[PDB]
Design an enzyme around this catalytic site. Structure first.
Site, short mmCIF file in Angstrom:
data_model
loop_
_atom_site.label_atom_id
_atom_site.label_comp_id
_atom_site.label_asym_id
_atom_site.label_seq_id
_atom_site.Cartn_x
_atom_site.Cartn_y
_atom_site.Cartn_z
N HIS B 62 0.79 -1.28 0.01
CA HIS B 62 -0.03 0.02 -0.02
C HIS B 62 0.74 1.20 0.16
O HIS B 62 0.29 2.48 0.46
CB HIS B 62 -1.07 0.11 1.32
N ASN B 135 -9.76 -3.06 3.39
CA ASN B 135 -9.82 -2.75 2.12
C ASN B 135 -10.96 -2.69 1.28
O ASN B 135 -12.06 -2.63 1.89
CB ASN B 135 -9.15 -4.16 1.38
N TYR B 349 2.26 -4.66 11.97
CA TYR B 349 2.23 -3.39 11.78
C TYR B 349 3.00 -2.61 13.14
O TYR B 349 3.48 -1.53 12.70
CB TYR B 349 0.79 -3.00 11.89
#
Ligand code: HEM
Ligand code: HEM
Ligand SMILES: [Ca+2]
Ligand SMILES: [Ca+2]
Ligand SMILES: [Ca+2]
Ligand SMILES: [Ca+2]
Ligand SMILES: [Ca+2]
Lengths: 678, 678
Positions: B62, B135, B349
């Site tokens: 992304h 998404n 993350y």
């Protein structure tokens, strides 16, 4: 093979961690079959940690590029002009790595943007790595390195919204150019075909700055580096470049990769202009000013050797992404000049590799290593690979018997600053008045283009400037353009809604210089690797037969043939749905496929009108086009292409078709198809 | 706002260093006016060091995206289903920041690539930051986070040459999809129009995973997040998306930026499906499997509140590039599930932000700060921006009177794991058999698309798979496709010159589900922000009057109107040279411009045939098109466009033209213009 010692093979074996323990990597360790994942799952974490840290900062400029390995071979012993070891004998070979690039776009931006381009070459010499970090345009936008961030912020996307990608299509870039008129020369270059080269192999490389060649006796001469393409100079046309940006963002990198894989590795003659130190101001400008060229009429090129690229990387990231060039990578025999743009670069490239590599040991990456021994007292730092045996890494020492020894002009083949160099005067933050003519050379470059080429440059200006919102900025741009050429200003102004200012003739002149025009540089010297699209149909076994015939004729001469039809099968490479004229240097329709050729042509297998549009686009973009088999009228009339047009071919005979069509590939572009301002 | 305190105003004042010393930054300091640059030039070095270090690693996936600020508003007190504080009262407002993205491409890659897209939303709640990192497609390719690097390596460019930038246009991607059949559901989504959304505003957001809503009493329910666009669902057509990638790589970021600037900030209903824990395996698949949707027929959506984006960033890098989302940013009232894809995300993350930020204090960047006080014993680290007063940062302590206090289900509104959760069984690296049906839902999806939408999906597969070199990979793809649908496999196989394998009916069925079709989702509920191109001419004063009368009417309905003519002037926004049909949602020709509309015209101001090609492209891509000004169907005939066609308008009266055309914009696409298979 040059980096073979670092290669890792994974064509056999069982998966292991980075410390050699055999593992799996496809299912997480869970507390029960439908349970949560365990922290003790080291297989998971080590793999995902690596993934999570794969990315490194892109280059601050030239982020988009591609590279290859090759060899340089010297044509002579050049000890009469330089001590440099890699140039010291006829036939002497030195490995090289080259990276080509655009400038403004980020690492995923399209190859075929309008931009300046990079051409960076590393010579892994027997006296150290030497880099020439050049561009495809011989002059730079600015005259002092301190201004680099101003230039680059102005062309890169506006920083509130990071729009637009596309360096010339917004107000800030033209604000900068119009306020900083030094920019005019490089701007005119970038607005020419040199802004959209046909490939990295069809552009030249320039050092831009004046450098010095220094002999072993201490004497020096001023030089410019010129890498002259042996493939010929060629451009895209602008509309085609725009389409290609969308259909194949990777076009230049693929062109290079493919050429190498096919044994057509690109070549350049590495050349210099050589002038005396006393001619620093003799040519009507200052050789310290990087916005000026030395016209070839004043100083001819000397061919030093051959550069050939013939081996693609094994791992792009490890080789191409991690190569870290520096103009500070200099060797005995070469020195700097006091060009204030060059001077500051020397700081920039050593510092920025800390950003990219995240630590100080970036010269230890395989691509950055030299191919001779390293003896120094640099130590430690994150990522230190070396295990140094000298436990007294200071100079002067006795406890390591005075090693490493100092190298200088008189011992150890040290680098030395050219000893004739001096400085005099006040310590100043002042620009030399010898730098002040920003417009004469842009006019010299414009005057040297052919009429159609001048039109293309005007048209690029019209296109980009019309995208500037600010009427003030537009006005300021025409003020500067008018100082180079009133006619340019008039013609540009006509597209953008403004009047050009009155002629100001201070810098106007009619002089021309050779070797800068693309359109004038004559037919290409080779057509090997050029792309021929053969448009056929599966609806007639005869059309496929014709395509096959033509393929063998064309392939014999080293052209890359694509047969297009509605669907794939043996002998057909590409469907109409994926095909586009940007994919070809020339387009041939086999007459067995004539029925497809209507804007009418409808099918669930390709967009309406696609076969014809490939032919029409090819024609509009200047390419050689024709119909092979004897019956050409139906196709040509549908395309609105005249049979007697230059670069339009029609023959029954395959041999005679190909003979004619190959002359058109060498001509490359039929510029009579483009309208001119009157 | 932690951001308002860090805004820096540079609208006045003299240039300073970063430590406030007034300086200059335009000329280097030199030893004489033509001399070398001095090491003591700190002005030079501080500026260039900052430039040299501007870049940070892009996101591992992304990387390409754009963001905006806004507000979320709760429609109710939802304490009957969740403890979450941002959802605890009717009308409660919480600030948000959202970033939208593609997945595979680097920075600078085009917005309109075919891809999955990100929709990440941060809620700056009064009980901490809460991120939903979603998404625009509700299902994911893989069923275990450990496989993420496999998926991503396979779809990113081949790592020897970094080719190609198009995620689905190469052998490795299809190799992976055909060997890992979990990928079929997302693959079908990505091959539909959901792969090429018309804008960020015209797509939905999905959390993908099953999560838990947890009440203050400790009870839990299973949920799926759905953010439902109030702008309507819309796609590009593929050829249009490819052109746009070249003509405007910034298309989606520009669309969003512009919509917010004009006061047309996009809206979504934030919804959930809610089901009991006992239904984990009640719907014919496992709710822990992120490759499956819960059909709306089985679990309707409940609307929780309104998401609106209405303020653009001030500095893209500081806000959008630096925002660091994590599914670990959870608040009391929400819990995880044992979905093995979600489970591993939680690790990634937190870790990957160390890569991007270069240090551990990334939550201190203004965009990442919370809106409530922070009380913890985290200390030090590079880039530490706080001066902590508490000199006893350990628990348990008496020296700081036992503060901070532990928070949990009982005390301090702590987060707590849903107390009903358990685990049982062996510690295993095994996939649940309940995850094994990889084909039924892809077929449910496919069955739900309309016929021309099914054709578009077949056609996307035909396009991409035809670019796969390996005949074996192609065969293996067909094997998987054929398990979803024999007809898809037949129709794809016909384009690539292979035969489809025999029907395997194990997973075939004819069931359908609501809300997944784009073509079926009906007219758009608003046409505000939609783009109308009016093709005019400066030749005829009638043409420009007609364009102005049209403009003024369309602009009142919130449409963005561009008048195109040969050159700029009063009333004209764009030249033919820069115009493209991809710039518009509808195209009008004013009849005064009829003379331009031939395959010729010719002009040095634009490429031959450009005016007509804008209109022809617009028609072929499905857009509403028309001629305003009567009696003339010379334009429609030159374009081969049928006057009786749906979405083709011809009216003398500007008001009747505007009434009809505005209906056409709502319809959006006229799909009768696309051919179907036989
Ligand atoms: C004659 C003028 C210049 C030329 C021909 C030039 C050429 C280039 C080239 C070709 C590259 C890419 C090398 C590669 O492919 O990796 C590059 C990168 C770069 N240049 Fe320049 N450059 C010029 C001036 C400047 C100036 C004035 C500065 C700074 C003051 C600058 C700073 C940089 C930086 C920071 C990088 C990224 C380097 C990296 O990350 O390794 N350059 N330059
Ligand atoms: C349901 C499946 C997934 C969804 C919906 C999803 C969504 C996203 C989104 C929207 C972003 C961009 C956020 C932004 O705009 O900054 C992103 C980034 C990322 N995702 Fe995922 N993701 C999924 C699965 C995975 C998995 C399984 C992993 C790793 C094992 C992963 C690792 C990452 C990483 C490393 C980043 C970059 C984050 C950063 O640098 O801030 N994702 N994801
Ligand atoms: Ca701007
Ligand atoms: Ca040209
Ligand atoms: Ca670091
Ligand atoms: Ca591949
Ligand atoms: Ca707990």
């Amino acid at each position: 093979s040059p980096l073979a010692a670092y290669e890792v093979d994974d064509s056999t074996g069982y998966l292991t961690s980075d410390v050699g323990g055999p593992i799996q990597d496809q299912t997480s360790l869970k507390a029960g079959i439908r349970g949560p994942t365990l922290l003790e799952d080291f297989m998971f974490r080590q793999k995902i940690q690596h993934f999570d840290h794969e990315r490194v900062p892109e280059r601050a400029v030239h982020a988009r590029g591609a590279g290859a390995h090759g060899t340089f071979t010297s044509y002579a012993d050049w000890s009469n002009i330089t001590a440099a070891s890699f140039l010291n004998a006829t036939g002497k070979q030195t490995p090289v790595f080259v990276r080509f690039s655009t400038v403004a776009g980020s690492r995923g931006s399209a190859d075929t943007a309008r931009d300046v381009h990079g051409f960076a070459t590393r010579f892994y010499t027997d006296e150290g790595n030497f880099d020439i970090v050049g561009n495809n345009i011989p002059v730079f936008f600015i005259q002092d390195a301190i201004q680099f961030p101003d230039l680059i912020h102005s062309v890169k996307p506006r920083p509130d919204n990071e729009i637009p990608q596309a360096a010339f299509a917004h107000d800030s870039a033209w604000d900068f150019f119009s306020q900083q008129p030094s920019t005019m020369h490089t701007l005119f270059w970038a607005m020419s075909g040199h802004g959209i080269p046909r490939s990295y192999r069809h552009m030249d490389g320039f050092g831009v700055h004046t450098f010095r060649f220094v002999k072993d006796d201490g004497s020096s001469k001023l030089i410019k580096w010129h890498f002259k393409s042996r493939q010929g100079k060629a451009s895209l046309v602008w509309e085609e470049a725009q389409v290609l940006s969308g259909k194949n963002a990777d076009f230049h990198r693929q062109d290079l990769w493919d050429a190498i894989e096919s044994g057509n590795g690109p070549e350049w003659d590495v050349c210099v202009q050589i002038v005396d130190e006393s001619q620093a101001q003799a040519f009507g400008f200052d050789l310290l000013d990087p916005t000026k060229i030395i016209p070839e009429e004043y100083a001819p090129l000397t061919k030093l050797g051959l550069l050939k690229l013939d081996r693609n990387p094994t791992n792009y990231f490890a080789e191409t992404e991690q190569v870290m060039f520096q103009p500070g990578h200099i060797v005995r025999g070469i020195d700097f000049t006091e060009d204030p743009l060059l001077q500051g670069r020397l700081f920039s490239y050593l510092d920025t590799q800390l950003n990219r590599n995240g630590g100080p040991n970036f010269e230890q990456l395989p691509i950055n290593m030299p191919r001779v021994p390293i003896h120094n007292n640099n130590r430690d730092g994150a990522g230190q690979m070396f295990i140094h045996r000298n436990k007294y890494p200071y100079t002067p020492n006795t406890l390591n018997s005075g090693y490493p020894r100092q190298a200088n002009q008189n011992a150890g083949r040290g680098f030395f600053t050219a000893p004739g160099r001096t400085a005099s005067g006040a310590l100043v933050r002042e620009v030399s008045p010898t730098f002040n003519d920003h417009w004469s050379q842009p006019r010299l470059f414009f005057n040297s283009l052919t009429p159609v080429e001048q039109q293309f440059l005007v048209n690029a200006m019209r296109f980009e400037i019309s995208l500037v919102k600010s009427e003030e900025v537009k006005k300021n741009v025409l003020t500067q353009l008018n100082r180079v050429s009133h006619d340019v200003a008039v013609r540009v102004a006509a597209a953008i809604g403004l009047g050009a200012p009155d002629a100001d003739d201070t810098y106007y002149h009619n002089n021309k210089t050779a070797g800068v025009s693309i359109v004038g540089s004559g037919p290409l010297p080779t057509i090997k690797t050029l792309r021929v699209g053969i448009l056929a149909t599966t609806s007639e076994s005869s059309a496929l037969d014709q395509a096959a015939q033509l393929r063998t004729r064309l392939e014999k001469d080293g052209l890359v043939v694509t047969v297009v039809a509605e669907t794939l099968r043996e002998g057909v490479d590409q469907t109409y749905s994926t095909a586009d004229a940007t994919g070809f240097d020339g387009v041939v329709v086999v007459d067995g496929a004539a029925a497809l050729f209507a804007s009418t042509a409808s099918s669930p297998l390709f967009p309406t009108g696609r076969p014809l549009q490939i032919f029409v686009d090819a024609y509009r973009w200047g390419k050689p086009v024709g119909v092979c088999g004897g019956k050409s009228s139906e196709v040509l009339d549908a395309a609105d292409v005249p049979e007697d047009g230059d670069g339009v071919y029609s023959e029954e005979s395959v041999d005679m078709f190909v003979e004619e069509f190959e002359k058109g590939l060498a001509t490359f572009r039929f510029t009579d198809r483009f309208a001119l301002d009157s």
